[PDB]
Every structure is written in C-alpha cells, then in structure tokens.
Amino acid sequence: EDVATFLRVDPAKGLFYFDNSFRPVPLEQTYVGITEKKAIKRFQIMNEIVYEKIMEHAGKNQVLVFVHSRKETGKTARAIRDMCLEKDTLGLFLREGSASTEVLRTEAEQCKNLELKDLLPYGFAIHHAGMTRVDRTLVEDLFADKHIQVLVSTATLAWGVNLP
Amino acid sequence: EDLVFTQGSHFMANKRCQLPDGSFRRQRKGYEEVHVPALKPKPFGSEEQLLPVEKLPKYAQAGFEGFKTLNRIQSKLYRAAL
C-alpha cells in the first residue's frame, strides 16, 4: 500500500496484490541454513548440501545451480562432478540416453571452451558472462532441450536468460 | 546517518516471520533445513476465467503472438491495463 501511495495508484482500481499462490509454477522452497561457526566447515557443508541436493534430483529433473562468481561457477560444477565420480553417481544424470548423450558428446567436442568441454560429456554445464556468446547460447540451448542435467551459472543468467 | 539503514537491501523491518502450514524445519547435521511446501493455487472464481487473445482489443492482438490465452494475473488486470 505504501508503494501504491508513492506511485499515486488508487487502492481500489490500480491496486493488485497477488500472493505466492498465484505463481504459475508452485515451487517447494528449501532453505539450507549453515549453523557452524567455522568458515572452512561451512564451505564444506555447502558443497555437501549442493551434492546432496543435486543427488536428490539427479535423473528426475534438471538442476539450475546459482553461483556468485564466474570462477566459482566452474569450480562448483566440477565440484559436483568430482563428488559424483567419487561416489559412483555420475551415471544418474546421463542414463542410456544416447540421443541426448550423443548430442552432449557431439557438442562438447565442437565446443571451444576448455572448462565447458570438461563437463560437456556429463550432465554438468557452465554458463557465465565471461564465456563466449556462442558457447553461452549452446548451454542455454542445451539446457532448454533437457540435455544438461546440472546447470551452474551466476546471477546474470537468471536475469538475462528466461530459461527456467 | 543514524536514520539510514546500514544493511541496505538486506534490512528487514519485520521482527517475526510467519511461514505456511506445512513448513516444518529440522537441523540434520550442522545446518538447519527449512522446507516451504509448494502453495496450492487459489481456486478460480465463479465468474473469473483466463480470457483468450480474441477478447482483448484488436489493437493489442498483434502483440500477443503465439499465446492463445492469457495468464491468471494478466486476465485479472486486462481491463485495468488496456
């Protein structure tokens, strides 16, 4: 109401307030709050939480990991891939789906980004603002086709790309 | 400087935060997991429906390319925006 009053909007005709139930996709929100007072332990728990969260929907649905820095997006994507390979859970995202698997394998080979080609063979992917436009568009194109199982990117993708 | 908010965009004016009914939380190991279940959509009104693009004025029909109908929020504010 204060914003409507600041904008000179009548509360009866111009006022429209839709709650969270009005969202087209009702999203189950999970909050992971680290309680440890050690910075090193908190960082380790966050990586485990991301790996645990990725494993909850490994082969079920795509995962859109949000990072803060461009280098962290690659480190986080490789961190999840390294944990998946260590636990032998790398094949959950990429099943016997050679149609999708061959496209990722074929697209990873033609990709010029060395960091993206390391995770291109698996379901992992990276989408940062420092990447090339052609490489960034392939990640958006690959993610929109249900090819990239886990997508890691900064906050720029959420605002510049309408890829849910 | 005293009247300003030091947090900036993270300043919270509310002391209490009320969550939904099925919003239980528990601390598993070193972290507290608070899950908010997906809220069920509000039931459609008896005299409210998603109007299609054929009901809006013909001037705005060209802009709505590829959309047969409108969203629930868009349909409820169609007369207040055009």
Add this chain to the structure above:
Amino acid sequence: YNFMGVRHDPNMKYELQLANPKEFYHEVHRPSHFLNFALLQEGEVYSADREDLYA
C-alpha cells in the same frame, strides 16, 4: 628523447611547431612505459559481474 634515446641521433632532422611543450614525464615522452604491456589475451573471462547502471 631521454627515455627512447636510441631514437635520438645527432645528425637527425626535425621540423618545428608553434605549440606548448609537454612535461618531462608526459605520456608521449616514455612510450616504453605505456606500449610494452601485453595485450589482454583471454582476459575478463573470470572477471566480476557488475552492471554499469549509469553508463
């Protein structure tokens, strides 16, 4: 010609110009301090994402 004095010759020729001289340590007087920089190769790929809201 103190910095790039290898380009200075006693028997060289020069024309004049009705202008004001630059400082001893001006940008154009020490080209080796401004032109020997390596080009930005594969730079700004891991930089910080900050939008220039005013520009």
